[PDB]
């Protein structure tokens, strides 16, 4: 449904933020 | 619906993330 | 309605992601 | 409600992000 | 109820945000 | 309940930020 919808898009956005803040973590390291 | 109206505003920022994150990898390798 | 007030406050964040992809995008750069 | 509630925090999640840009244009400006 | 859930994780959002614009900041004031 | 899996995301999404924005603060040390 429609619900369903939102929570596939809300596991993309996590999926996302987690690669953001892996190259926030390269950032630091360099 | 509105339903699905939140749906594709959460697919617009899980875009405009991914591109987030292939910014942050660039400032990572320089 | 209230659920379109929510969608409305996520287009406003989709707006400010871009804005934050577009300057990390000239971080890059520079 | 909690659905206002929702909004609410969504309207605080927003000024938050506006301000990330904003320190983020800054970056870019000393880049 | 799960619509107070929701609200308490977008509040703890809002948070890590807030603190993600000082960091920032920092990088920014230096 | 699709309920509380969007309250599951946001725990995630909430998650990911707190790591950003400790990522960013050892940008911000450095």
């Known amino acids: 449904g429609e619900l369903k919808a939102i929570a596939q898009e809300l596991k993309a956005i996590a999926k996302e933020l987690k690669a953001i803040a892996w190259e926030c973590k390269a ?4």
């Open 27 to 30: 950032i630091a390291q360099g």
